[PDB]
């Protein structure tokens, strides 16, 4: 069962939890070729592995950088999780390091791109194309949580699309194993729930009210709360008054009105029954949740093959001090 | 149209994270 599978993921979980891998390769293994994307503290580029001839997308953060903007235990957290986890739609950390100025996780490369960029150029996805990626994330916030896990950043920018379709999610930068509560203020301004917002100390069901706006941001083309200020989208995400296109089917609308629940007493994902509320809902009614999980599902969309499906960036070359930098702060890493 | 609102907004670009 679903209950039975979970315990048995979690004993696999718990094992790599409190034991991580550490010091699993060296930069000098990696051939670099090109940088795929950047982030607040670095840059992710493709890479070869020499020695099989392997590719992989490997992130590279400035320990510096990381320290200033107070993400150390964030940092930590992101590696210690994803060398835990294992699940069909979230990314491999393959190896991991560190030198005297940066972080490496080298990660599988997802050579489709991020869903960003063809949700942008597209405009906006169907509602099958849409409920395709979105019982993708059901299915793997489903796992995480039941892992003690939340997120706390879905958005396109991070959901690769894989030479099958389906959805890879990167950067764990936020995702933290928590019983209870937290508190951090962390995100994306469009995709917070209001509670966070509001400083009210906050749970998983922080990645439901993600996922709706997720849903709606891929059906719309748009998400459900944007102004060209973060102030002014926090006053109409607390507002919580959502508007649909008129093109919305009656059960998408419906879902997302669930979704999108200021009320933590009203929010699907987060009743008496947690997932199923979502699962079960009409507007999945198309869905199988099992062939889904087993890939066997043909998708909507796939990608044209070779790195034409990611944007250029600016390049730099990769310096590595000859002092030592926060070596205590990073010392589990 | 909320569409053209969107597209001439300053958010169309990738998002940053609140740190
Ligand atoms: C906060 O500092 C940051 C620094 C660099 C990058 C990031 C965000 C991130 O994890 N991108 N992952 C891209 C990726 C890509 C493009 C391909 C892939 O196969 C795997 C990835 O993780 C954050």
Redesign the interface.
């Known amino acids: 069962s679903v209950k039975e599978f979970l315990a048995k993921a979690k004993e696999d979980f718990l094992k790599k939890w409190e034991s991580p891998a550490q010091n699993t390769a060296h930069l000098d293994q990696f051939e670099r070729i090109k940088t795929l994307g950047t982030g607040?503290f670095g840059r992710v580029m493709l890479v070869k592995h020499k020695e099989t001839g392997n590719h992989y997308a490997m992130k590279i953060l400035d320990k510096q950088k990381v320290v200033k903007?107070?993400?150390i235990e964030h940092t930590l957290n992101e590696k210690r999780i994803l060398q835990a986890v294992n699940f069909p739609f979230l990314v491999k950390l393959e190896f991991s390091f560190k030198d005297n100025s940066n972080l490496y996780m080298v990660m599988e490369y997802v050579p489709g791109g991020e869903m960003?960029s063809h949700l942008?150029r597209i405009?906006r996805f169907s509602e099958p194309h849409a409920r395709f990626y979105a019982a993708q994330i059901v299915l793997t916030f489903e796992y995480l949580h039941s892992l003690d896990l939340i997120y706390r950043?879905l958005?396109p920018?991070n959901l690769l699309i894989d030479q099958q379709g389906y959805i890879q999610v990167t950067d764990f930068?936020?995702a933290k194993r928590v019983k209870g509560r937290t508190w951090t203020?962390?995100?994306?301004?469009?995709y917070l729930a209001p509670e966070i917002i509001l400083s009210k100390g906050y749970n998983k069901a922080v990645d439901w009210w993600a996922l709706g706006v997720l849903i709606y941001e891929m059906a719309?083309?748009?998400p459900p709360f944007?102004?060209?200020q973060?102030i002014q989208?926090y006053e109409k995400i607390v507002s919580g008054k959502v508007?649909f296109?008129s093109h919305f089917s009656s059960d998408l609308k419906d879902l997302l009105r669930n979704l999108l629940q200021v009320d933590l007493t009203k929010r699907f994902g987060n009743l008496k029954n947690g997932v199923n509320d979502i699962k079960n809902h009409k507007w999945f009614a198309t869905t199988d949740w099992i062939a889904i999980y087993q890939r066997k599902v043909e998708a909507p969309f796939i990608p044209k093959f070779d790195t034409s499906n990611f944007d250029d960036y600016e390049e730099e070359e990769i310096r590595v001090s000859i002092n030592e930098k926060c070596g205590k702060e990073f010392s589990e890493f | 149209t909320?569409?053209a609102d969107?597209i001439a907004?300053?958010?169309?670009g990738?998002?940053?994270?609140?740190?």
């Open positions: 607040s903007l107070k993400q960003f942008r405009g950043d958005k920018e930068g936020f203020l962390c995100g994306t301004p469009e719309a083309g748009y944007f102004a060209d973060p989208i508007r296109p | 909320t569409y969107f907004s300053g958010r169309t990738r998002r940053n994270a609140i740190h």
